[PDB]
Design a binder for this molecule. Sequence first.
Ligand SMILES: *[C@@H]1O[C@H](CO[C@@H]2O[C@@H](C)[C@@H](O)[C@@H](O)[C@@H]2O)[C@@H](O[C@@H]2O[C@H](CO)[C@@H](O[C@@H]3O[C@H](CO[C@H]4O[C@H](CO)[C@@H](O)[C@H](O)[C@@H]4O)[C@@H](O)[C@H](O[C@H]4O[C@H](CO)[C@@H](O)[C@H](O)[C@@H]4O)[C@@H]3O)[C@H](O)[C@H]2NC(C)=O)[C@H](O)[C@H]1NC(C)=O
Ligand SMILES: *[C@@H]1O[C@H](CO[C@@H]2O[C@@H](C)[C@@H](O)[C@@H](O)[C@@H]2O)[C@@H](O[C@@H]2O[C@H](CO)[C@@H](O[C@@H]3O[C@H](CO[C@H]4O[C@H](CO)[C@@H](O)[C@H](O)[C@@H]4O)[C@@H](O)[C@H](O[C@H]4O[C@H](CO)[C@@H](O)[C@H](O)[C@@H]4O)[C@@H]3O)[C@H](O)[C@H]2NC(C)=O)[C@H](O)[C@H]1NC(C)=O
Ligand code: NA
Ligand code: NA
Ligand code: NA
Ligand code: NA
Lengths: 237, 237, 30, 30, 297, 119, 60, 9, 9, 197, 50
Amino acid sequence: RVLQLKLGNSAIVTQEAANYCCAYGEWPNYLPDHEAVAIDKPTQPETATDRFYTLRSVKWEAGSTGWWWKLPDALNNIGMFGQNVQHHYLYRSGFLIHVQCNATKFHQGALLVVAIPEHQRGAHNTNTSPGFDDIMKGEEGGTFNHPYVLDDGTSLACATIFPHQWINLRTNNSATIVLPWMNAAPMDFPLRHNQWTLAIIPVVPLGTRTMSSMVPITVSIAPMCCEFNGLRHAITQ
Amino acid sequence: RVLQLKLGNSAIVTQEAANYCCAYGEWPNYLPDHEAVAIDKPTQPETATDRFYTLRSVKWEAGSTGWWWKLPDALNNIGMFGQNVQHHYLYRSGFLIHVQCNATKFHQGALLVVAIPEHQRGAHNTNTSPGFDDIMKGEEGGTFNHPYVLDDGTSLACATIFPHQWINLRTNNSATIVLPWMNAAPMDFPLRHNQWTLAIIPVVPLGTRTMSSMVPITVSIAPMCCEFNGLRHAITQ
Amino acid sequence: QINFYKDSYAASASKQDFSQDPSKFTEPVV
Amino acid sequence: QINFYKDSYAASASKQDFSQDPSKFTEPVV
Amino acid sequence: IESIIKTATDTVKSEINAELGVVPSLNAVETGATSNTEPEEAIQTRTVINQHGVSETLVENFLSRAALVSKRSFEYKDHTSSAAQTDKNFFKWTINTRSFVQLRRKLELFTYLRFDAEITILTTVAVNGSSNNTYVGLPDLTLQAMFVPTGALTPEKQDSFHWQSGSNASVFFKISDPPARMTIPFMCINSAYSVFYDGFAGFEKSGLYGINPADTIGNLCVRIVNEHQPVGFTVTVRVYMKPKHIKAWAPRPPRTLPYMSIANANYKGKGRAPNALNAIIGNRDSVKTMPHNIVTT
Amino acid sequence: TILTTVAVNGSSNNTYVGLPDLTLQAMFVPTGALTPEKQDSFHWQSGSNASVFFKISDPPARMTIPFMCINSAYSVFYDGFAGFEKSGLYGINPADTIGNLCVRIVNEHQPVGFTVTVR
Amino acid sequence: IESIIKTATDTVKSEINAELGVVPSLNAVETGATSNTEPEEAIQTRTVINQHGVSETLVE
Amino acid sequence: NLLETRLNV
Amino acid sequence: NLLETRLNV
Amino acid sequence: SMMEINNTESAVGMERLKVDISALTDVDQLLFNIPLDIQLDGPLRNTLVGNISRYYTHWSGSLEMTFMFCGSFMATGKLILCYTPPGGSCPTTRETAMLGTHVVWDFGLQSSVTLIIPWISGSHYRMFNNDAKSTNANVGYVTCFMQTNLIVPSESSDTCSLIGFIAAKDDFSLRLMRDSPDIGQLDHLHAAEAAYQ
Amino acid sequence: GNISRYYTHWSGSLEMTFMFCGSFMATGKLILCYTPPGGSCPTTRETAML
Ligand SMILES: *[C@@H]1O[C@H](CO[C@@H]2O[C@@H](C)[C@@H](O)[C@@H](O)[C@@H]2O)[C@@H](O[C@@H]2O[C@H](CO)[C@@H](O[C@@H]3O[C@H](CO[C@H]4O[C@H](CO)[C@@H](O)[C@H](O)[C@@H]4O)[C@@H](O)[C@H](O[C@H]4O[C@H](CO)[C@@H](O)[C@H](O)[C@@H]4O)[C@@H]3O)[C@H](O)[C@H]2NC(C)=O)[C@H](O)[C@H]1NC(C)=O
Ligand SMILES: *[C@@H]1O[C@H](CO[C@@H]2O[C@@H](C)[C@@H](O)[C@@H](O)[C@@H]2O)[C@@H](O[C@@H]2O[C@H](CO)[C@@H](O[C@@H]3O[C@H](CO[C@H]4O[C@H](CO)[C@@H](O)[C@H](O)[C@@H]4O)[C@@H](O)[C@H](O[C@H]4O[C@H](CO)[C@@H](O)[C@H](O)[C@@H]4O)[C@@H]3O)[C@H](O)[C@H]2NC(C)=O)[C@H](O)[C@H]1NC(C)=O
Ligand code: NA
Ligand code: NA
Ligand code: NA
Ligand code: NA
């Protein structure tokens, strides 16, 4: 129920957690010599990159459909993680994700918090594939069009097969998930492929009869075991 | 006489060197626990920062007075070294400096190549101290006003007390110097104090009677054992 | 040598370190 | 330290008790 | 638990933490204990070996410095026509630490104190500057300082038979000497002096609050020994006290508002902040305003 | 080491008269801290500051100040600007400034003027 | 290499030299090192025992 | 005086 | 003064 | 001992010792900030660590700030407390401030939280000049933001208070003693002539 | 020179070193002479070489 997380110069405490999830029972690590491909000595920044970054908060409204962010895309312009991404051809890391939302003992509501590997989106009612600007939202993230089918023609009801937790407002005020590297290749080009999508979906809507207040949701993400290869001049998105 | 230098993804070869200089007989190292002050875990980027960077070349003319660059100021906006400088309050490193200039067997000339610790400049014929823009030149560096007194009321003739080499065009085409950390404190704020000044001065002027060609001088610098402390949001100069 | 003060920095001058190494200025090469 | 007086209260200052216990002010609880 | 401490504490290296049931950054202020959270528990640290000494903050070093406790000026002359209130070539002083504010505030950091007192006496002279007088040079006078216990009989004139000093200690000294010096022992009827006293030191209801005469060290009675000269001079005497062999108990909130009186703790404050009755710290425009904010250009 | 000398003021109103054996006070004050505003200021009470009192007839006054820098050595030369803004002087680091001496004559003025020199 | 020095250095006696591949009077100033040529290598010397002290040039 | 006796005149 | 503060008046 | 964080013209006496917070309708908002220079006048000056430090000229070591929540039992919320090392202006936004040293605090059965201000300095000691912008003196900044919101039912008070405290750790040290700037006189005190009667 | 001028008496050997800064294709030979004291500085090679 009570938890402290400490990485680099950053710390988080919570007094109302519900254990935490390690995706597929696995923990982040550096790339071993028997799995490696690129022959140059890698950059390993440690405490410069492996720390919590906090994104803009979002408002939970009566009509909300839910929210999403893509990794590494949402961090590719933030701090020394963004600077190492812009100067290297190749990247690899895990992540530790912490999602925060509090309300009174008179409020009710439930959020599904889920990490989806290779979340390839579909468009609604057309033969044409999604464009670059439908997919690459950066730090702001996006919203679900049809959360009941996860925007991909599958279902929300079966989404519990992926690494997940819930925030149920009578029980807990936070969710925590640990993610390993998840790809078919040992490293990748960070500006064109996303390994993971974080999704937050309000399955039971926010409600009360007490005084109305604005109820935000806040996301903090820490990269783990960062490595970079193929140093050169800077390219942005 | 023949030398290869290899750091990170970068290499330099020369076929006409003259040994190399280690300043005061000392070699770069990381800060040990019995000399440390700041208590946070440091960032140590290794191959992302510890590699050769090459500056703009300059032209050696018949009337040239000589050239200078200040460290770390000349590197504070270059690559992943510049990004780590902009996001941290504290910095520490050594340097490896390589100076390049070639001409024919019919050319003559001699350059003094010298590294000056705490080179505090003076102004000529006024009581007022030098301004911020007289001192902080960045990547472009500056030129000597009165090289015969080193722009500080001392002398060029005694400058051989500092770490130095010569380029004498009949003998050699390059000079190499290795610099340790040199300060009264174990770490410093990189945007306001410079530990070292590189100076290049033409004591014997360029001359020939053969075909005229443009004769450049080129500077390559590699940081060594970089460390950073006190992570936060970015500040530039 | 006479010193009755409690702090060691009060003492007389230290004129007895005969150690040298000129080579850090005369021979700084490999 | 030089003292030729017969009464002990005449002596120089006493600068050598390095003992401490902060916990009588910082942790006065069971 | 008591221990010997000669330097500031070392720092140990520390790793990532994620552990259920453990929250070292949370505390319970209501108990009255200070927070026990350590740096290694709040952030990732390196190893540091700390060599900084702690001796300059020892209580003996903090209090054992000679401070000014009395300054008195008087005229050395024929006093045949002087008024009844004048110091006629001599004066009385009751020893106290209440009159000069730098020593008073330092002693008032504590509730009880035990010490011996080292007393140093400094004397200076000048020719009287009325229009009848030229400068003439300065006399090397002898002075007498006699110790008299609290409330005991003191001399009434410069040539009194009381100056015979048959059991009282007297010190005789010249202006050309180094300053006079002697030590007074810890003299209290109790095991320590009371710096503050919450009571009335008499069996009837009528007298002053907050003064216990058992904490008054004594009197100095001071005269010039020489007869008067044909011309007048002004003599100034300064007394310094240094506490030594010190023990101290029960530390206290420091004085914030200016002192009003030697006799009590009465208060009024400055007219505007800082150190006003309704505002101790100087103002800023809001709780979001940073007062010395760095501007970069 | 502090050396003091005195002479009678040489304006045409004055004859020679002899020289006074004055007491002086020298108070140590840290770099940038508050200093006395007048000869008779209550700041001269010196409650934690070190003061030395000495006479003109004594040998010269003497005391030792320790190595006081915030760094492991003083910087004789300094290639930088010791402030977070761009605006101030080049080449001066206040961490290398040892402190202040505040010096007064302790005696009240005499009916005639003198010139005092302190080295 | 650090050592304890209390007096100026002694001089050793020296003979005629004529030797191929050996040139102690030639140097390479471009390296930044000071010339290491000794008096015994430049001229014929006698033996001298030198008792001159070096304490008046100590930094203290 | 008041420091010797704790009485006011 | 400039030796205490490194500012010019 | 208690910090005087509310040092403002309209706060009188005991009101200067607490900070009031209330529910907001915008996300991520700034609540207050604190200057850290322990030699100067400001919220830290009239504290046990502030008062004793001002008899000395040089200092070193870590500090801790502890905050206590004084709302009702039914009130809930989360805050973020940040320390920013020196170099430029104090941060005005949560996404700037969270890049520094910080703790995220949840209100609950434990009433109070500690922020460590670690010793991070180029030199062994910092130095009391009379210049707040010196590289030998400036410590950086503390800032507080909403992490969620203050959320309370209709029968609780809509406005709740924090009390802030400060102390040194046992890595702390002081040197070069001086007369304190917190006390002084221009005259003799009342009844001072009575010692000569 | 600068350090010696803080003192009044001196003793011991000195060395002079010369560097040639012509082109690679330039050639020549020089003679460098030291003359102990007693009279005028030599003006001819057959005097100086003694
Ligand atoms: C690969 O690209 C294909 C071509 O894309 C177009 O051409 C290129 C060169 C660019 O200019 C590009 O910007 C163009 O979009 C792309 O195929 C196209 O896909 C769109 C979207 O699905 C099709 O639009 C729909 O068209 C029908 C009408 O079809 C008739 O007319 C067209 C000519 O205009 C003929 O080609 C057809 O054979 C039919 O005869 C519309 O009814 C439909 O919806 C509209 O009407 C409904 C109500 O019924 C409204 O609700 C909607 O809002 C609309 O107003 C679409 O507009 C487009 O016909 C199709 N073109 C061709 C030539 O095939 C293909 O999707 C891309 N492939 C992938 C995998 O992305
Ligand atoms: C600290 O700041 C000092 C003040 O700086 C000025 O005031 C501030 C508030 C700003 O406005 C700032 O921008 C100003 O510069 C600074 O002192 C100043 O330093 C300058 C440069 O050395 C002095 O200029 C020289 O002045 C003389 C003339 O002096 C007479 O006139 C002035 C009034 O104008 C009087 O104050 C003096 O007492 C004299 O009566 C010029 O002759 C000289 O050179 C010119 O002439 C020669 C030929 O002779 C030409 O070759 C030159 O090109 C010039 O044309 C300079 O112009 C300036 O007088 C001085 N002001 C004061 C009030 O002292 C100080 O240097 C700074 N300190 C440090 C450590 O940097
Ligand atoms: Na220690
Ligand atoms: Na009290
Ligand atoms: Na010898
Ligand atoms: Na200061």
